């Protein structure tokens, strides 16, 4: 009988897919089990537990510009955005798993691509050939979630528990953008020769992979002055990295290179083009109700063209 409120603003701003969480910290925990009650009931989780957990996934993230704790909740919130626009096509255990996933999908960034790992030659490259930080980051998950007092999912049996982190799993390895280009593909072809079928386990693991995508990406889905300030976050990491490249003697590709600032609006044009206009133009043909995202994505893509005309 203990429910959560928002102020009457963030009630109804919250259901949309372009909410911004806001600047208050304090607030992101009381956000985040909002969205999982109104996803999966009050009952479906320990209210200690969980706020047990929110708080060590907190401590788990880094003080990085853009990888950071208001990542992990934006990421969130957009997934839950996706769950109550499809209310009836996902399962109960799916819709438990998958705001989780999305909160830890992040856990322990440093603010590196899985591409310096490789060649810094950092232990996690030896211990996972590929999806090096994806892998990390579900056995940080898998860590938090065998703490004293922490485990959430305490009420499913064996078989229950074992599914829900096969889930939680697939969703945070479909994190790793270098697989998206596949599982699109491959999804924009079941969807056209009428073959895609939600009954199949297989195009159901795709289908979530797009969607893990599809909130992973969504600062492009934003109102254009959120859009414009988180990539200012985005660009410090590339930067970042950018310097650390140059300290092991390579050449950073543009994208990385402080020296080459001036290339950024036509780089997002790039990325607009070849990867989230791609990303929710498919996740739109498979669940009508997220155009939404599609819609913000055209604009911000358009705000962008602006910019390089000197508008
Ligand atoms: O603004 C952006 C410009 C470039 N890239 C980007 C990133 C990786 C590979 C590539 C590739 F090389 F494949 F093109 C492009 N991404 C973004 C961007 C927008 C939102 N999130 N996000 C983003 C940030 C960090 C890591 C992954 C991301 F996806
Ligand atoms: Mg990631
Ligand atoms: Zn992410």
């Not at 999806?131 to 007092?149: A, P």
């Not at 074992?162 to 697939?170: A, D, M, P, S």
């Not at 969703?171 to 079928?197: C, H, P, V, W």
């Not at 300030?229 to 990491?237: F, G, M, S």
Request: net charge neutral.
């Amino acid at each position: 009988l203990m429910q959560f409120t928002l102020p009457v603003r963030l009630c109804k701003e919250i259901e949309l897919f372009h909410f911004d969480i806001g600047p208050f910290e304090n607030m992101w925990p009381g956000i985040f089990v909002y969205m999982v009650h109104r996803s999966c009931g009050t009952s479906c989780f320990e209210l200690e537990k969980l706020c047990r957990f929110i708080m060590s996934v907190k401590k788990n993230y880094r003080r990085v510009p853009y990888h950071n704790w208001k990542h992990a909740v934006t990421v969130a919130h957009c997934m839950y955005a996706i769950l109550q626009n499809n209310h009836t096509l996902f399962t109960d255990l799916e819709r438990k798993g998958l705001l989780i996933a999305c909160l830890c999908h992040d856990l322990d960034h440093r603010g590196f691509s899985n591409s310096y790992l490789q060649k810094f030659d950092h232990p996690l490259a030896a211990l996972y050939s590929t999806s090096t930080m994806e892998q990390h980051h579900f056995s940080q998950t898998v860590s938090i979630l065998q703490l004293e007092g922490h485990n959430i999912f305490s009420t499913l049996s064996s078989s229950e528990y074992e599914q829900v982190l096969e889930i939680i799993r697939k969703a945070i390895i479909a994190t790793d953008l270098a697989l998206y280009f596949g599982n699109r593909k491959q999804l924009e072809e079941m969807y056209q020769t009428g073959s895609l079928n939600l009954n199949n386990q297989s195009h159901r693991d795709r289908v979530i992979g797009l969607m893990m995508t599809a909130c992973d990406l969504c600062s492009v889905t934003k109102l254009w002055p959120v859009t414009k300030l988180t990539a200012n976050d985005i660009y410090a990491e590339f930067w970042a990295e950018g310097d650390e490249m140059k300290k092991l003697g390579i050449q950073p590709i543009p994208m990385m290179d402080r020296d080459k600032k001036d290339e950024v609006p036509q780089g997002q044009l790039g990325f607009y083009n070849a990867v989230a206009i791609p990303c929710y133009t498919t996740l739109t043909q498979i669940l009508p109700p997220t155009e939404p995202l599609l819609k913000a994505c055209r604009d911000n893509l358009s705000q962008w063209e602006k910019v390089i005309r000197g508008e």
